[PDB]
Amino acid sequence: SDVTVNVSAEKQVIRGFGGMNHPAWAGDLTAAQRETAFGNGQNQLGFSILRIHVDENRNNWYKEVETAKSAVKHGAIVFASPWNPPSDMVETFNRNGDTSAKRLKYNKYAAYAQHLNDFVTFMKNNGVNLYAISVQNEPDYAHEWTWWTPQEILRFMRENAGSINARVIAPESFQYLKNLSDPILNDPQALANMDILGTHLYGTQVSQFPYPLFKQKGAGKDLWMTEVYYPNSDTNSADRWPEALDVSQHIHNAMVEGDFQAYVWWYIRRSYGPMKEDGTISKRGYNMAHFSKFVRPGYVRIDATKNPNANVYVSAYKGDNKVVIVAINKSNTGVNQNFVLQNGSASNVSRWITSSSSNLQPGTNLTVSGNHFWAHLPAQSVTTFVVNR
Numbered sequence: 447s448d449v450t451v452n453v454s455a456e457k458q459v460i461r462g463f464g465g466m467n468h469p470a471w472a473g474d475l476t477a478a479q480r481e482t483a484f485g486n487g488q489n490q491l492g493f494s495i496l497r498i499h500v501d502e503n504r505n506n507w508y509k510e511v512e513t514a515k516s517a518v519k520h521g522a523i524v525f526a527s528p529w530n531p532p533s534d535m536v537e538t539f540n541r542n543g544d545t546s547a548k549r550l551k552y553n554k555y556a557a558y559a560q561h562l563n564d565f566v567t568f569m570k571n572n573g574v575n576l577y578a579i580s581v582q583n584e585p586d587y588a589h590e591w592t593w594w595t596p597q598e599i600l601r602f603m604r605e606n607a608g609s610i611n612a613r614v615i616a617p618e619s620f621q622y623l624k625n626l627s628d629p630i631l632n633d634p635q636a637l638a639n640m641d642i643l644g645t646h647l648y649g650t651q652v653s654q655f656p657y658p659l660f661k662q663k664g665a666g667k668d669l670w671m672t673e674v675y676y677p678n679s680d681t682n683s684a685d686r687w688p689e690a691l692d693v694s695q696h697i698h699n700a701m702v703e704g705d706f707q708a709y710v711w712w713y714i715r716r717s718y719g720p721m722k723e724d725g726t727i728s729k730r731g732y733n734m735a736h737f738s739k740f741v742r743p744g745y746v747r748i749d750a751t752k753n754p755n756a757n758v759y760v761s762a763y764k765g766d767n768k769v770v771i772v773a774i775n776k777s778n779t780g781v782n783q784n785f786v787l788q789n790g791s792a793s794n795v796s797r798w799i800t801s802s803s804s805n806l807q808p809g810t811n812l813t814v815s816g817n818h819f820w821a822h823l824p825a826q827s828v829t830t831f832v833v834n835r
Protein backbone atom coordinates (compact mmCIF):
# COMPACT_ATOMS: atom_id res chain seq x y z
CA SER A 447 0.00 0.00 0.00
CA ASP A 448 1.05 3.59 0.71
CA VAL A 449 3.19 4.68 3.59
CA THR A 450 2.50 8.31 4.45
CA VAL A 451 5.24 10.12 6.32
CA ASN A 452 4.16 13.49 7.71
CA VAL A 453 7.25 15.62 8.30
CA SER A 454 5.27 18.14 10.38
CA ALA A 455 3.54 15.75 12.76
CA GLU A 456 6.27 15.78 15.39
CA LYS A 457 6.24 13.19 18.20
CA GLN A 458 8.77 12.35 20.93
CA VAL A 459 12.33 13.69 20.90
CA ILE A 460 14.90 10.86 20.81
CA ARG A 461 17.74 10.73 23.37
CA GLY A 462 19.30 7.55 21.98
CA PHE A 463 19.94 3.82 22.12
CA GLY A 464 22.45 1.64 23.88
CA GLY A 465 23.11 -1.02 26.46
CA MET A 466 24.46 -1.93 29.86
CA ASN A 467 28.00 -2.37 31.11
CA HIS A 468 28.58 -4.47 34.24
CA PRO A 469 32.23 -5.33 34.91
CA ALA A 470 31.38 -7.25 38.10
CA TRP A 471 28.68 -9.50 36.60
CA ALA A 472 29.67 -9.55 32.92
CA GLY A 473 33.25 -8.29 32.74
CA ASP A 474 34.13 -4.77 31.62
CA LEU A 475 34.38 -4.04 27.90
CA THR A 476 37.87 -4.08 26.42
CA ALA A 477 39.30 -0.93 24.82
CA ALA A 478 38.47 -2.26 21.34
CA GLN A 479 34.94 -3.23 22.39
CA ARG A 480 34.33 0.33 23.62
CA GLU A 481 35.16 1.56 20.13
CA THR A 482 32.72 -0.93 18.61
CA ALA A 483 29.97 0.07 21.04
CA PHE A 484 30.12 3.84 20.91
CA GLY A 485 31.89 4.72 17.68
CA ASN A 486 29.57 5.32 14.75
CA GLY A 487 32.01 4.18 12.07
CA GLN A 488 31.67 1.19 9.74
CA ASN A 489 31.31 -2.07 11.77
CA GLN A 490 30.42 -0.10 14.91
CA LEU A 491 27.14 0.18 16.81
CA GLY A 492 26.90 3.97 17.37
CA PHE A 493 25.24 3.50 20.74
CA SER A 494 24.46 6.92 22.16
CA ILE A 495 23.51 5.78 25.68
CA LEU A 496 25.37 3.75 28.31
CA ARG A 497 23.84 2.31 31.44
CA ILE A 498 26.07 1.44 34.40
CA HIS A 499 25.20 0.30 37.91
CA VAL A 500 25.58 2.09 41.24
CA ASP A 501 27.36 -0.45 43.41
CA GLU A 502 26.20 -0.70 47.03
CA ASN A 503 29.87 -0.61 48.04
CA ARG A 504 31.75 2.60 47.09
CA ASN A 505 35.09 0.76 46.93
CA ASN A 506 33.78 -0.83 43.71
CA TRP A 507 32.74 2.44 42.05
CA TYR A 508 36.17 2.97 40.39
CA LYS A 509 35.55 -0.11 38.16
CA GLU A 510 32.94 1.75 36.07
CA VAL A 511 35.16 4.66 35.04
CA GLU A 512 37.21 3.60 31.97
CA THR A 513 34.17 2.42 29.98
CA ALA A 514 32.05 5.41 31.07
CA LYS A 515 34.85 7.80 30.08
CA SER A 516 34.99 6.10 26.70
CA ALA A 517 31.27 6.56 26.09
CA VAL A 518 31.45 10.28 26.90
CA LYS A 519 34.49 10.71 24.67
CA HIS A 520 32.20 9.42 21.85
CA GLY A 521 29.25 11.64 22.80
CA ALA A 522 27.17 9.02 24.55
CA ILE A 523 25.27 10.03 27.67
CA VAL A 524 25.68 7.90 30.78
CA PHE A 525 23.12 7.03 33.43
CA ALA A 526 23.12 4.74 36.40
CA SER A 527 20.83 2.30 38.20
CA PRO A 528 21.11 1.01 41.81
CA TRP A 529 20.18 -2.60 42.69
CA ASN A 530 20.80 -2.40 46.48
CA PRO A 531 21.53 0.28 49.08
CA PRO A 532 24.67 -0.32 51.15
CA SER A 533 23.82 -3.30 53.45
CA ASP A 534 23.76 -1.21 56.67
CA MET A 535 20.72 0.62 55.19
CA VAL A 536 18.79 -2.54 54.42
CA GLU A 537 16.48 -4.58 56.66
CA THR A 538 14.58 -7.82 56.08
CA PHE A 539 10.81 -7.88 56.54
CA ASN A 540 7.81 -10.13 56.04
CA ARG A 541 6.57 -9.62 52.50
CA ASN A 542 3.39 -11.78 52.15
CA GLY A 543 5.04 -14.77 53.90
CA ASP A 544 8.52 -14.26 52.46
CA THR A 545 10.77 -13.23 55.38
CA SER A 546 14.01 -12.99 53.32
CA ALA A 547 12.53 -9.86 51.64
CA LYS A 548 14.87 -6.85 51.74
CA ARG A 549 13.93 -3.14 51.92
CA LEU A 550 15.53 0.25 52.65
CA LYS A 551 15.04 1.22 56.30
CA TYR A 552 12.38 3.92 56.71
CA ASN A 553 14.90 5.99 58.66
CA LYS A 554 17.62 5.63 56.00
CA TYR A 555 16.01 7.48 53.03
CA ALA A 556 18.09 10.64 53.46
CA ALA A 557 21.23 8.49 53.86
CA TYR A 558 20.49 6.59 50.65
CA ALA A 559 19.84 9.84 48.77
CA GLN A 560 23.33 10.81 49.95
CA HIS A 561 24.72 7.46 48.80
CA LEU A 562 23.37 8.11 45.28
CA ASN A 563 24.67 11.66 45.37
CA ASP A 564 28.09 10.42 46.39
CA PHE A 565 28.14 8.29 43.22
CA VAL A 566 27.22 11.26 41.02
CA THR A 567 30.00 13.28 42.68
CA PHE A 568 32.46 10.38 42.38
CA MET A 569 31.75 9.92 38.67
CA LYS A 570 32.15 13.67 38.11
CA ASN A 571 35.66 13.67 39.67
CA ASN A 572 36.62 11.13 37.00
CA GLY A 573 35.33 13.22 34.12
CA VAL A 574 31.88 11.65 33.72
CA ASN A 575 28.86 13.94 34.13
CA LEU A 576 26.24 11.31 34.79
CA TYR A 577 23.14 12.30 32.78
CA ALA A 578 20.79 10.64 35.27
CA ILE A 579 20.53 8.28 38.22
CA SER A 580 17.75 5.86 39.11
CA VAL A 581 16.02 5.33 42.47
CA GLN A 582 15.95 1.50 42.26
CA ASN A 583 16.19 -1.15 39.57
CA GLU A 584 12.99 -3.21 39.37
CA PRO A 585 11.59 -2.52 42.89
CA ASP A 586 8.47 -4.53 42.00
CA TYR A 587 10.48 -7.69 41.16
CA ALA A 588 13.24 -7.59 43.75
CA HIS A 589 13.42 -11.28 44.85
CA GLU A 590 17.22 -11.06 44.59
CA TRP A 591 17.59 -7.38 45.63
CA THR A 592 15.66 -4.53 47.34
CA TRP A 593 11.84 -4.33 47.28
CA TRP A 594 9.88 -1.06 47.29
CA THR A 595 6.12 -0.70 47.39
CA PRO A 596 4.46 2.02 45.30
CA GLN A 597 3.98 3.98 48.56
CA GLU A 598 7.62 3.64 49.59
CA ILE A 599 8.65 4.90 46.14
CA LEU A 600 6.22 7.82 46.44
CA ARG A 601 7.60 8.87 49.82
CA PHE A 602 11.16 8.89 48.51
CA MET A 603 10.13 10.86 45.40
CA ARG A 604 8.23 13.41 47.53
CA GLU A 605 10.89 13.81 50.20
CA ASN A 606 14.35 12.76 49.03
CA ALA A 607 14.73 12.76 45.23
CA GLY A 608 14.87 16.56 45.23
CA SER A 609 18.13 16.41 47.15
CA ILE A 610 19.81 14.43 44.39
CA ASN A 611 22.19 16.58 42.33
CA ALA A 612 21.12 14.99 38.99
CA ARG A 613 18.21 13.95 36.81
CA VAL A 614 16.28 11.28 38.65
CA ILE A 615 14.84 8.21 36.92
CA ALA A 616 11.88 6.40 38.53
CA PRO A 617 10.43 3.76 39.09
CA GLU A 618 11.89 1.12 36.67
CA SER A 619 9.12 -1.50 36.99
CA PHE A 620 10.21 -4.78 35.40
CA GLN A 621 7.05 -4.90 33.27
CA TYR A 622 5.78 -1.30 33.03
CA LEU A 623 3.14 -2.00 35.66
CA LYS A 624 1.36 1.35 35.87
CA ASN A 625 0.53 0.86 39.58
CA LEU A 626 4.15 1.55 40.43
CA SER A 627 4.17 4.85 38.58
CA ASP A 628 0.55 6.11 38.93
CA PRO A 629 1.13 7.35 42.51
CA ILE A 630 4.03 9.64 41.39
CA LEU A 631 2.17 11.04 38.36
CA ASN A 632 -0.77 11.76 40.64
CA ASP A 633 1.31 13.74 43.14
CA PRO A 634 2.50 17.23 42.14
CA GLN A 635 5.39 17.19 44.60
CA ALA A 636 6.70 13.75 43.62
CA LEU A 637 6.18 14.46 39.94
CA ALA A 638 8.28 17.63 40.36
CA ASN A 639 11.29 15.58 41.50
CA MET A 640 11.06 13.06 38.68
CA ASP A 641 12.85 13.98 35.46
CA ILE A 642 12.58 10.68 33.64
CA LEU A 643 9.91 8.03 33.98
CA GLY A 644 11.85 4.82 33.46
CA THR A 645 10.60 1.30 32.82
CA HIS A 646 11.49 -2.15 31.66
CA LEU A 647 9.31 -4.21 29.33
CA TYR A 648 9.85 -7.88 30.38
CA GLY A 649 6.66 -9.67 29.26
CA THR A 650 4.86 -6.42 28.49
CA GLN A 651 2.19 -6.86 25.80
CA VAL A 652 2.00 -4.15 23.14
CA SER A 653 -1.48 -3.14 24.43
CA GLN A 654 0.21 -2.04 27.67
CA PHE A 655 2.78 0.14 25.85
CA PRO A 656 0.62 3.29 25.80
CA TYR A 657 0.33 5.26 29.06
CA PRO A 658 -2.63 7.70 29.03
CA LEU A 659 -1.87 9.07 32.49
CA PHE A 660 1.67 9.96 31.43
CA LYS A 661 0.28 11.79 28.38
CA GLN A 662 -2.00 13.68 30.70
CA LYS A 663 0.33 14.60 33.57
CA GLY A 664 3.87 14.09 32.21
CA ALA A 665 4.52 17.33 30.28
CA GLY A 666 8.27 18.16 30.44
CA LYS A 667 9.13 14.64 31.60
CA ASP A 668 11.24 12.13 29.63
CA LEU A 669 10.02 8.60 29.01
CA TRP A 670 12.78 5.98 28.89
CA MET A 671 12.99 2.25 28.28
CA THR A 672 15.99 1.52 30.55
CA GLU A 673 16.44 -2.26 30.22
CA VAL A 674 15.44 -5.21 28.04
CA TYR A 675 16.49 -8.26 26.08
CA TYR A 676 14.15 -9.62 23.44
CA PRO A 677 12.81 -12.03 22.44
CA ASN A 678 14.90 -14.18 24.82
CA SER A 679 18.26 -14.82 26.48
CA ASP A 680 18.87 -18.19 24.82
CA THR A 681 22.57 -19.08 24.78
CA ASN A 682 24.13 -18.18 21.39
CA SER A 683 20.79 -16.89 19.99
CA ALA A 684 22.26 -13.58 18.82
CA ASP A 685 22.74 -14.70 15.21
CA ARG A 686 19.52 -16.68 14.71
CA TRP A 687 17.58 -15.36 11.70
CA PRO A 688 14.68 -14.37 11.24
CA GLU A 689 14.60 -14.39 15.06
CA ALA A 690 16.86 -11.27 15.32
CA LEU A 691 14.21 -9.33 13.41
CA ASP A 692 12.18 -9.42 16.62
CA VAL A 693 14.65 -6.92 18.06
CA SER A 694 13.88 -4.19 15.59
CA GLN A 695 10.15 -4.91 15.83
CA HIS A 696 10.36 -4.48 19.56
CA ILE A 697 12.15 -1.12 19.15
CA HIS A 698 9.52 -0.25 16.58
CA ASN A 699 6.82 -0.84 19.19
CA ALA A 700 8.68 1.10 21.89
CA MET A 701 9.01 4.11 19.59
CA VAL A 702 5.66 3.91 17.94
CA GLU A 703 3.37 2.62 20.68
CA GLY A 704 5.26 3.47 23.86
CA ASP A 705 6.50 6.83 22.60
CA PHE A 706 9.80 6.04 24.36
CA GLN A 707 12.73 8.36 24.00
CA ALA A 708 15.41 5.89 24.94
CA TYR A 709 15.84 2.19 24.33
CA VAL A 710 18.49 0.49 26.45
CA TRP A 711 19.52 -3.14 26.17
CA TRP A 712 20.92 -5.31 28.92
CA TYR A 713 24.55 -6.47 28.68
CA ILE A 714 26.12 -5.00 25.57
CA ARG A 715 28.43 -8.02 25.13
CA ARG A 716 26.74 -11.44 25.42
CA SER A 717 25.92 -14.56 23.40
CA TYR A 718 22.39 -13.13 23.09
CA GLY A 719 23.38 -9.44 22.96
CA PRO A 720 24.14 -6.81 20.29
CA MET A 721 27.80 -7.67 20.67
CA LYS A 722 29.04 -11.24 20.55
CA GLU A 723 31.79 -12.56 22.83
CA ASP A 724 34.39 -12.38 20.03
CA GLY A 725 33.60 -8.63 19.98
CA THR A 726 31.76 -8.61 16.63
CA ILE A 727 28.24 -7.40 16.01
CA SER A 728 25.46 -9.99 16.16
CA LYS A 729 22.33 -10.06 14.01
CA ARG A 730 20.53 -8.67 17.06
CA GLY A 731 23.17 -5.90 17.06
CA TYR A 732 22.59 -4.91 13.46
CA ASN A 733 18.85 -4.77 14.20
CA MET A 734 19.58 -2.18 16.91
CA ALA A 735 22.06 -0.41 14.59
CA HIS A 736 19.25 0.22 12.09
CA PHE A 737 18.04 2.66 14.71
CA SER A 738 21.10 3.61 16.71
CA LYS A 739 23.40 4.47 13.85
CA PHE A 740 20.92 6.73 12.07
CA VAL A 741 18.52 8.08 14.71
CA ARG A 742 20.97 10.31 16.50
CA PRO A 743 20.28 12.13 19.83
CA GLY A 744 18.15 15.17 19.04
CA TYR A 745 16.19 13.55 16.21
CA VAL A 746 12.41 13.66 16.50
CA ARG A 747 9.97 10.90 15.72
CA ILE A 748 7.41 11.91 13.11
CA ASP A 749 4.07 10.41 12.11
CA ALA A 750 4.26 7.59 9.59
CA THR A 751 1.91 4.78 8.64
CA LYS A 752 3.03 2.25 11.24
CA ASN A 753 1.89 -1.00 9.72
CA PRO A 754 0.89 -0.63 6.03
CA ASN A 755 1.03 -4.37 5.13
CA ALA A 756 0.93 -7.64 7.03
CA ASN A 757 4.22 -7.99 8.86
CA VAL A 758 5.57 -4.74 7.50
CA TYR A 759 6.37 -2.20 10.20
CA VAL A 760 7.38 1.43 9.60
CA SER A 761 8.61 4.33 11.76
CA ALA A 762 10.09 7.71 10.78
CA TYR A 763 12.27 10.40 12.38
CA LYS A 764 13.63 13.77 11.35
CA GLY A 765 16.80 15.58 12.36
CA ASP A 766 19.89 17.26 10.92
CA ASN A 767 18.06 17.87 7.58
CA LYS A 768 17.32 14.19 7.07
CA VAL A 769 14.27 12.04 7.34
CA VAL A 770 15.05 8.54 8.57
CA ILE A 771 12.64 5.72 7.84
CA VAL A 772 13.00 2.24 9.33
CA ALA A 773 11.04 -0.42 7.40
CA ILE A 774 10.85 -3.94 8.79
CA ASN A 775 9.50 -6.75 6.61
CA LYS A 776 8.79 -9.75 8.77
CA SER A 777 7.08 -11.80 6.11
CA ASN A 778 8.48 -14.49 3.82
CA THR A 779 7.67 -12.35 0.80
CA GLY A 780 9.24 -9.23 -0.69
CA VAL A 781 6.85 -6.30 -0.78
CA ASN A 782 6.97 -3.15 -2.83
CA GLN A 783 6.28 -0.17 -0.60
CA ASN A 784 5.42 3.36 -1.72
CA PHE A 785 6.56 6.13 0.62
CA VAL A 786 4.81 9.50 0.45
CA LEU A 787 6.31 12.59 2.12
CA GLN A 788 3.79 15.16 3.33
CA ASN A 789 4.65 18.79 4.28
CA GLY A 790 8.18 18.33 2.94
CA SER A 791 10.10 17.72 -0.26
CA ALA A 792 13.22 15.64 -0.86
CA SER A 793 15.68 14.41 -3.50
CA ASN A 794 18.03 11.45 -2.98
CA VAL A 795 17.45 8.38 -0.78
CA SER A 796 20.17 6.09 0.60
CA ARG A 797 19.60 2.80 2.46
CA TRP A 798 21.10 -0.11 4.30
CA ILE A 799 19.60 -3.59 4.56
CA THR A 800 19.91 -6.44 6.97
CA SER A 801 18.78 -9.94 6.05
CA SER A 802 19.72 -13.63 6.45
CA SER A 803 22.80 -13.12 4.32
CA SER A 804 23.82 -9.44 4.73
CA ASN A 805 24.57 -6.91 7.51
CA LEU A 806 23.77 -3.19 7.14
CA GLN A 807 24.58 -3.43 3.51
CA PRO A 808 24.12 -0.48 1.14
CA GLY A 809 21.31 -0.82 -1.34
CA THR A 810 20.92 1.09 -4.54
CA ASN A 811 20.15 4.79 -4.19
CA LEU A 812 16.61 5.91 -5.03
CA THR A 813 15.25 9.26 -6.14
CA VAL A 814 12.09 11.14 -5.13
CA SER A 815 9.36 11.60 -7.76
CA GLY A 816 7.45 14.64 -6.53
CA ASN A 817 6.62 13.66 -2.97
CA HIS A 818 7.24 9.92 -3.09
CA PHE A 819 9.44 6.93 -3.89
CA TRP A 820 8.95 3.18 -4.33
CA ALA A 821 11.25 0.72 -2.61
CA HIS A 822 11.30 -3.01 -2.46
CA LEU A 823 11.41 -4.54 1.02
CA PRO A 824 13.16 -7.90 0.81
CA ALA A 825 11.63 -10.86 2.63
CA GLN A 826 12.63 -11.13 6.31
CA SER A 827 14.53 -7.84 6.13
CA VAL A 828 15.07 -4.53 7.93
CA THR A 829 15.89 -1.44 5.88
CA THR A 830 16.80 2.05 7.03
CA PHE A 831 16.22 4.79 4.46
CA VAL A 832 18.03 8.10 4.82
CA VAL A 833 16.26 10.85 2.92
CA ASN A 834 17.97 14.17 2.12
CA ARG A 835 15.98 17.40 2.12
Ligand SMILES: CO[C@H]1[C@H](O)[C@@H](O)[C@@H](O[C@H]2[C@H](O[C@@H]3CO[C@@H](O)[C@H](O)[C@H]3O)OC[C@@H](O)[C@@H]2O)O[C@@H]1C(=O)O
Nearest residue numbers: 471472529583584620646648673679680681713716
Ligand atom coordinates in the same frame (compact mmCIF):
# COMPACT_ATOMS: atom_id res chain seq x y z
C1 LIG B 1 21.11 -16.85 30.57
O1 LIG B 1 21.48 -16.11 31.76
C2 LIG B 1 21.08 -14.69 31.71
C3 LIG B 1 19.71 -14.37 32.38
O2 LIG B 1 18.63 -14.95 31.63
C4 LIG B 1 19.47 -12.85 32.56
O3 LIG B 1 18.25 -12.60 33.26
C5 LIG B 1 20.63 -12.17 33.29
O4 LIG B 1 20.70 -12.58 34.68
C6 LIG B 1 21.58 -11.72 35.47
C7 LIG B 1 20.69 -11.10 36.57
O5 LIG B 1 20.19 -10.01 35.79
C8 LIG B 1 18.83 -9.63 35.96
C9 LIG B 1 18.15 -10.00 34.65
O6 LIG B 1 16.78 -9.64 34.69
C10 LIG B 1 16.61 -8.20 34.74
O7 LIG B 1 15.21 -7.97 34.82
C11 LIG B 1 17.29 -7.58 35.96
O8 LIG B 1 17.29 -6.14 35.87
C12 LIG B 1 18.74 -8.09 36.11
O9 LIG B 1 19.29 -7.66 37.36
O10 LIG B 1 21.39 -10.53 37.73
C13 LIG B 1 22.47 -11.37 38.28
C14 LIG B 1 23.52 -11.59 37.18
O11 LIG B 1 24.65 -12.26 37.75
C15 LIG B 1 22.92 -12.36 35.98
O12 LIG B 1 23.87 -12.36 34.90
O13 LIG B 1 21.85 -12.43 32.53
C16 LIG B 1 22.20 -13.86 32.39
C17 LIG B 1 23.58 -13.94 31.70
O14 LIG B 1 24.57 -14.00 32.46
O15 LIG B 1 23.64 -13.94 30.46
